[PDB]
Design a protein around this ligand. Structure first.
Ligand SMILES: Cc1ccc(NNC(=O)[C@@H](O)[C@H](N)CC2CCCCC2)cc1
Ligand SMILES: [Mn+2]
Ligand SMILES: [Mn+2]
Length: 369
């Protein structure tokens, strides 16, 4: 079918067949020896294997298409003057429609991160936040969608002042380098090393000061699992990491962060992000308020991340203490904003890739980034 200017037509209605557009497909990187992998996108044994998980790939694609159309729409109206809340509500309303939100079967994978300046991630406004987007602000729009738990974790950076251009370019190039180096049997530490090489190859000048872009060392990429945004493996963006290898059938979020500060982040500001620990099982709770809140989370989010605004919209009131109890019990983990030093600028770019038996698919790739 056809999408209305302001996106409103759910993605599955634009593809009645049930088959969604594939992302960018690439040949796996050749081995150190010089061994090519073009045989994978050919081997009958791999082909059947890949086709066997087609429904899965397809679900990732449905979510990726939603992500592509939502972000394009956002890039058309995001502007200084708007509050962070106005920005997140407008984005999420469109996302809910295009993904055709349906309980845990289809919806938003996590809250809309819109971290500003020295803060690189995990910031989304809570109720009452009067923060307004400024002309010189560098905002990281990081939002996700999912179908049946197949998560699309994709992100980009927003600026209005050209002075940040090379900084954005550096991080974008670094993220793309990480995407190219990634592959079946590729060592994670090699990906991180390669990413840092590109990142540090860039130098920038902002308001009279020059800087060699630094990747944020304590931030990183990660493997993705069903309903588990952080499956267990990590993709470093600096050298010195694990020699652990990426494997066939795995899904990864290739994300990098560049900064003009220390290249290190720390918790800062009021927490807005929360997510149930995946490994913790059922826990009996008598405390009335804490019990109800946990039930609401299990029903509406499962192991998917959420924020306070999402609790508010569900009619929940005065739940902070109950939420703190859940955190203290280790049932829910808080994810406060991660920021570099005051006055520093940070940028981010992220894509979700599928390590298919036949090829490497950058499922969330768009004509934008
Ligand atoms: C240190 C470290 C840094 C980043 C990551 N992964 N990625 C992220 O957190 C972002 O790209 C996610 N979209 C945001 C989300 C991830 C789960 C917890 C709530 C916030 C994992 C570890
Ligand atoms: Mn993300
Ligand atoms: Mn991520």
């Amino acid at each position: 079918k056809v999408q209305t200017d302001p996106p409103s037509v759910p993605i599955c209605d634009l593809y009645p067949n049930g088959v969604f557009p594939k992302g960018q497909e690439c040949e796996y990187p050749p081995t150190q020896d010089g061994r090519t992998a073009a045989w994978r996108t050919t081997s009958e044994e791999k082909k059947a294997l890949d086709q066997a998980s087609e429904e899965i790939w397809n679900d990732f694609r449905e979510a990726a298409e939603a992500h592509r159309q939502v972000r394009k729409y956002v890039m058309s109206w995001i502007k200084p003057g708007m509050t962070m809340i106005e920005i997140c509500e407008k984005l999420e309303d469109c996302s809910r429609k295009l993904i055709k939100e349906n309980g845990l079967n289809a919806g938003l994978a996590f809250p809309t991160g819109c971290s500003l300046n020295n803060c690189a991630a995990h910031y989304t406004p809570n109720a009452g936040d009067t923060t307004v987007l400024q002309y010189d602000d560098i905002c990281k729009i990081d939002f996700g969608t999912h179908i049946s738990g197949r998560i699309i974790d994709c992100a980009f950076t927003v600026t209005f002042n050209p002075k940040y251009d090379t900084l954005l370019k550096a991080v974008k190039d670094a993220t793309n380098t990480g995407i190219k180096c990634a592959g079946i049997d590729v060592r994670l530490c090699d990906v991180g090393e390669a990413i840092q090489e590109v990142m540090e190859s860039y130098e920038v000048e902002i308001d009279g000061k020059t800087y060699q872009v630094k990747p944020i060392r304590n931030l990183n990429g990660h493997s993705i699992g069903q309903y588990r945004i952080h499956a267990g493996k990590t993709v470093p963006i600096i050298k010195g990491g694990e020699a652990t290898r990426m494997e066939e059938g795995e899904v990864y979020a290739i994300e990098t962060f560049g900064s003009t500060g220390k290249g290190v982040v720390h918790d800062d500001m009021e927490c807005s992000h929360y997510m149930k620990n995946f490994d913790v099982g059922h826990v009996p709770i008598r405390l009335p308020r804490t019990k109800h809140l946990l039930n609401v989370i299990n029903e509406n989010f499962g192991t998917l991340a959420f924020c306070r605004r999402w609790l508010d919209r569900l009619g929940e009131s005065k739940y902070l203490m109950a939420l703190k109890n859940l955190c203290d019990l280790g049932i829910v983990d808080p994810y406060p904003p991660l920021c570099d030093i005051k006055g520093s600028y940070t940028a981010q770019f992220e894509h979700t890739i599928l390590l298919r038996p036949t090829c490497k698919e950058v499922v969330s790739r768009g004509d934008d980034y």
